[PDB]
């Protein structure tokens, strides 16, 4: 499926919510697909569907866990090309548990490895890079 990229977003991370959903802010509480190991904080990367809660935003989205997808990461990571490509800020989008895009559009550039794994986030994306 996807390749292994540097895990930059541990639990308790606070990321921008890069869509027109109303939430200004997500708060990572766990990452899907991680099998744990003593004392290691689960970490999230681009394309990692996570569980996030909104700490600053629309009151109709706050105080409930919800699947998100990380689309921008500030931790440099090693593309297979050799380049260490990264973004300016950590940012994610709210998705339904199957991965359908909850919102309508995505503000800011979006990662290619996230797009090629999530078709609908890829569709709502505006500038893949």
């Amino acid at each position: 499926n996807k390749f292994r990229m540097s895990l930059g977003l541990p639990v308790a991370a606070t990321v921008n919510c890069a869509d027109n959903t109303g939430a200004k802010n997500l708060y990572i509480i766990s990452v899907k697909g991680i099998k744990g190991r003593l004392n290691r904080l689960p970490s999230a990367c681009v394309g990692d569907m996570v569980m996030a809660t909104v700490k600053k935003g629309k009151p109709d989205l706050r105080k409930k866990v919800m699947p998100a997808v990380i689309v921008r990461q500030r931790k440099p990571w090693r593309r297979k090309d050799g380049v260490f490509m990264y973004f300016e800020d950590n940012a994610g989008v709210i998705v339904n548990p199957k991965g359908e895009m909850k919102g309508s559009a995505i503000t800011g550039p979006i990662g290619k490895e996230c797009a090629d794994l999530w078709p609908r986030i890829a569709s709502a994306a505006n500038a893949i890079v």
């Binding site: 090309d81 050799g82 380049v83 973004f87 300016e88 800020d89 800011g108």
Partner: protein, 61 residues
């Protein structure tokens, strides 16, 4: 081969090296090494560092 130009020092990066920073305005900036990345992040202007190709082409050296 397909080289590419750094957008701070203007020097050709060869395949297998380079750091590309994706600024929030969706532009792609390819730095050749750490030194360009840091001079860029520190808010310095490439056209005023005496070693940069932008400086050299601006003063015709």
């Amino acid at each position: 081969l397909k080289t590419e130009l750094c957008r701070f020092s203007g020097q050709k990066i060869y395949p297998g090296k380079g750091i590309r920073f994706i600024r929030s305005d969706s532009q792609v900036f390819l730095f050749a090494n750490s030194k360009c990345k840091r001079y860029f992040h520190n808010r310095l202007k490439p056209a005023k560092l005496c070693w940069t190709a932008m400086y050299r082409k601006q003063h015709k050296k």
